[PDB]
Amino acid sequence: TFGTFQDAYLSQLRDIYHSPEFRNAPRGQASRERIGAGFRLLDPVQRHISVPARRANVVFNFAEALWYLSGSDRLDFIQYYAPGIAAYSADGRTLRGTAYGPRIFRHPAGGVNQWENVVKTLTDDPDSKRAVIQIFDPRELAVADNIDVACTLALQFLIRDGLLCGIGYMRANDAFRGAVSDVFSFTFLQEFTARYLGLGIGTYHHVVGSVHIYDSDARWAERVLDAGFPAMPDGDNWPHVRRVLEWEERLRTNAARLSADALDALDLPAYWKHVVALFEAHRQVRHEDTPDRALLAALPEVYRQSLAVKWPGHFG
Amino acid sequence: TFGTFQDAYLSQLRDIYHSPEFRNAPRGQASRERIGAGFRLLDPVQRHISVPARRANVVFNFAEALWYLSGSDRLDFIQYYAPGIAAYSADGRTLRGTAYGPRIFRHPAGGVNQWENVVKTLTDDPDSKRAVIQIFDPRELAVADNIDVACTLALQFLIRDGLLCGIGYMRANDAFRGAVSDVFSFTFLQEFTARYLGLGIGTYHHVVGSVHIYDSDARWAERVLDAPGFPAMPDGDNWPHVRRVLEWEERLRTNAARLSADALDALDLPAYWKHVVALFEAHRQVRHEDTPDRALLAALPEVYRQSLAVKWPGHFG
Numbered sequence A: 001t002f003g004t005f006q007d008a009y010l011s012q013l014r015d016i017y018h019s020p021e022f023r024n025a026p027r028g029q030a031s032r033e034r035i036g037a038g039f040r041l042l043d044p045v046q047r048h049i050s051v052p053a054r055r056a057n058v059v060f061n062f063a064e065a066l067w068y069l070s071g072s073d074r075l076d077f078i079q080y081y082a083p084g085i086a087a088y089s090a091d092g093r094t095l096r097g098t099a100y101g102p103r104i105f106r107h108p109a110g111g112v113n114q115w116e117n118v119v120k121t122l123t124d125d126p127d128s129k130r131a132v133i134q135i136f137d138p139r140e141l142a143v144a145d146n147i148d149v150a151c152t153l154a155l156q157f158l159i160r161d162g163l164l165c166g167i168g169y170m171r172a173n174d175a176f177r178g179a180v181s182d183v184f185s186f187t188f189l190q191e192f193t194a195r196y197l198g199l200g201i202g203t204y205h206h207v208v209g210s211v212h213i214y215d216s217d218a219r220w221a222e223r224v225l226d227a228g229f230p231a232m233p234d235g236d237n238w239p240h241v242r243r244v245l246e247w248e249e250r251l252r253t254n255a256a257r258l259s260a261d262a263l264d265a266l267d268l269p270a271y272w273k274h275v276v277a278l279f280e281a282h283r284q285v286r287h288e289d290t291p292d293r294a295l296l297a298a299l300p301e302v303y304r305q306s307l308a309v310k311w312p313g314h315f316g
Numbered sequence B: 001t002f003g004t005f006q007d008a009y010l011s012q013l014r015d016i017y018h019s020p021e022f023r024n025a026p027r028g029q030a031s032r033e034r035i036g037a038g039f040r041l042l043d044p045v046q047r048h049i050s051v052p053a054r055r056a057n058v059v060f061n062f063a064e065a066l067w068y069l070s071g072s073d074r075l076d077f078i079q080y081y082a083p084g085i086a087a088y089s090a091d092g093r094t095l096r097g098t099a100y101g102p103r104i105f106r107h108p109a110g111g112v113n114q115w116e117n118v119v120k121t122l123t124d125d126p127d128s129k130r131a132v133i134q135i136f137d138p139r140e141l142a143v144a145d146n147i148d149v150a151c152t153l154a155l156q157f158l159i160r161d162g163l164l165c166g167i168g169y170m171r172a173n174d175a176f177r178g179a180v181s182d183v184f185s186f187t188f189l190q191e192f193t194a195r196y197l198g199l200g201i202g203t204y205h206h207v208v209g210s211v212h213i214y215d216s217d218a219r220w221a222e223r224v225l226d227a228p229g230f231p232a233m234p235d236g237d238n239w240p241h242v243r244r245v246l247e248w249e250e251r252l253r254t255n256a257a258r259l260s261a262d263a264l265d266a267l268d269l270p271a272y273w274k275h276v277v278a279l280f281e282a283h284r285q286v287r288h289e290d291t292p293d294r295a296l297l298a299a300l301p302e303v304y305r306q307s308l309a310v311k312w313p314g315h316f317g
């Protein structure tokens, strides 16, 4: 049990790096590994990693979570924030196992919107043990030479004492890289759903079959070992997400830009204005426009620190 | 971490009973509950409960596991061993979420034999992290008033240091009743698969979203709280033996045949599977009111004799 994700993240990283159970090479990727590992977070909203040596990217973290909420499998959207994710696209256009959006909202088994069914299940029986979003699909292992097999099995939500608890079940999790964005996204979905249901945030449980540090990340993991997040507004945030996704697409494609004062004047809750400002900052970097230091100064300090460490030549 | 399932079972039972995180009533079923609970077994073959107050039914244990291997969803097979299970059959003929057989061997999401794909995956890449059998299906929540939604999410197998390790992921588990047969079945499938792959047995991990004791079981669970090795399955491909065992299972369940102690010893089966068919003949004696055979009983492994003697003491005690 940990208070924040960063404490759990660093504890687990130390366990795997210094006390691995196995050394092996699944699909040729040499790794340190432990089997059957998990942790509990008492405060899932505190979902960010701020250790400067880790250079956690809060823009990618929100982008991935909103990519899921958009229901999209398109590579162009997410590789803009994480160019290396193109390695898992067989067609150069879409992602399969990596794209949890379609798994949540139009699952390959029947096209089912599982998020809606979970909300209906919890509304009809608040104590339900059945409110599960299935991610994995049985046909993924029937694909020959599949380069992108879902590694999350399911997400479960439970309403307990007026709080929404969440459980993420994964068959495998990269303890150094993937875990940072997976726990961010799963606790983001948990909070989003809690707000929608009018509930407080309960605990988050992460449970993983194989937790591992790839040997190719050993040096960076060692640098990290040698070294408040704001709350989403109450209620139904879908209208805000739709507007943020509109700004996301226009900024990513450089079809729009917004100054610091334009951002502050957007008709959005402050929480979501800051997410749009992250995307405008990222546009300045990727499309080589003038970095806006007034933009940076208006962000929450957690975001300011992420930007200054990720892009010190722009925001440092 | 526990040496045997019985140690983990009793420890989890006492944890839920004495220190439940929640008391609630999903679908109106009042319970004591803990969230996100798991354990690790070092010896998954030692999968049985031998506390007499629990009256664990090794015949049902093997019947459920073989029902899964048969790929069947039929109620008539399994309700013969567990009469109350018909409460989860909407049509009186089949089981849905309770029937893991079709989920393993012909999953409704594409008609996929996942066991075959797991064996192929682990043969092509022994270190694979992908060898997962999915059980739950997203369409199960799509219609209201479903009385039988799968509570197992997935089973994963990993080859680590030449040993087949298993992980069962469940969204919910009855810690007092269902967990006894679920862990039996999952570690049985683990051992079966390891023998097929020519591997030894590693660890088994059980992880469950909601683990609970139903209030209606509290009296029995209190009695259990107030209160011999399991044999190893033979090496190699046990499918041909399973097929023969299933032929005998149906003949005995329908009272179309009977097996004397000498008829059991003459079966063309490894000793391990002869004992399983003997369990079915003993069960036939119970269900069809035939003479309890003392000689059958004496030839069984000690673990099985104790289960029969406690469960049906007038027949086998």
Ligand SMILES: Nc1ccn([C@@H]2O[C@H](COP(=O)(O)O)[C@@H](O)[C@H]2O)c(=O)n1
Pocket: A026, A027, A098, A149, A151, A172, A173, A174, A175, A177, A178, A179, A182, B129, B130
């Ligand atoms: N969301 C994701 C997607 C992939 N991953 C990583 O990618 C790997 C995919 O390779 P396998 O399919 O071989 O497992 C996982 O084992 C895990 O290391 C992750 O940790 N989180």
Ligand SMILES: Nc1ccn([C@@H]2O[C@H](COP(=O)(O)O)[C@@H](O)[C@H]2O)c(=O)n1
Pocket: A129, A130, B026, B027, B098, B149, B151, B172, B173, B174, B175, B178, B179, B182
């Ligand atoms: N294999 C199975 C099948 C059912 N069960 C029990 O049946 C219940 C089914 O009800 P829910 O669908 O409400 O969970 C589970 O919560 C669990 O108590 C089990 O423990 N093992």
